[PDB]
Amino acid sequence: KVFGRCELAAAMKRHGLDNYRGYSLGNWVCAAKFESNFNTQATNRNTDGSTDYGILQINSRWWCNDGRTPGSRNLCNIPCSALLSSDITASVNCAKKIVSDGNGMNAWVAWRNRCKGTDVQAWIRGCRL
């Protein structure tokens, strides 16, 4: 499923991401825009053999099992395919673990490079939240 901007913001707010670990909703919408273009089915293979999955491009090296990333961990205790669902619950629950692990949203390269330090509230303006 390809989310609309405000549709995703409302879904993320419902799932508790607004101000989660101090990150306002616009941060999460911005990260999703640039990681996956709001597409829950996005996958991208990395140069380390891991793959990034879903709307927040969560990586199989650490966070989910895809059966083809040898020596990897599965810290969210989910198959990576669960991260491609139209239901974003699994992605959000896993993202909450990632953002809590010490480095905040710097875990998402696109957030660091394209959202951090910008007017991220723009990503939720005009939405009825």
Element (H, E) at 96: helix 89-99
Contacts for 37-43: CB closer than 8 Å, 24+ residues apart: 37/2, 38/2, 38/3, 38/4, 38/5, 38/8, 39/1, 39/2, 39/3, 40/1, 40/2, 40/3, 40/83, 40/84, 40/85, 40/86, 40/88, 40/91, 41/1, 41/84, 43/84
Catalytic hit among 35, 48, 87, 119: 35
Tokens standing for 26? 């616009």
Burial of 102 per CB tally in 10 Å (0-12, 13-18, 19+): exposed
Alpha carbons 124 and 52: distance in angstroms, whole number? 25
Strand blocks (E) in the chain:
43-45, 51-53, 58-59
52 is catalytic: yes
Resolution in units of Å: 1.6
For the chain, the distance separating the N- and C-terminal CA atoms, rounded to the nearest angstrom, is 21
**Method used to solve the structure:** X-ray
Residues at the binding site for substrate are 101
Range of the domain at 18: 1-129
CATH number at residue 70: 1.10.530.10
Q: Give how many domains the chain has, as a whole number.
A: 1
35 is catalytic: yes
Alpha-carbon dihedral sign for residues 9, 12, 13, 18:
negative
Element (H, E) at 35: helix 25-36
Catalytic hit among 7, 18, 48, 52: 52
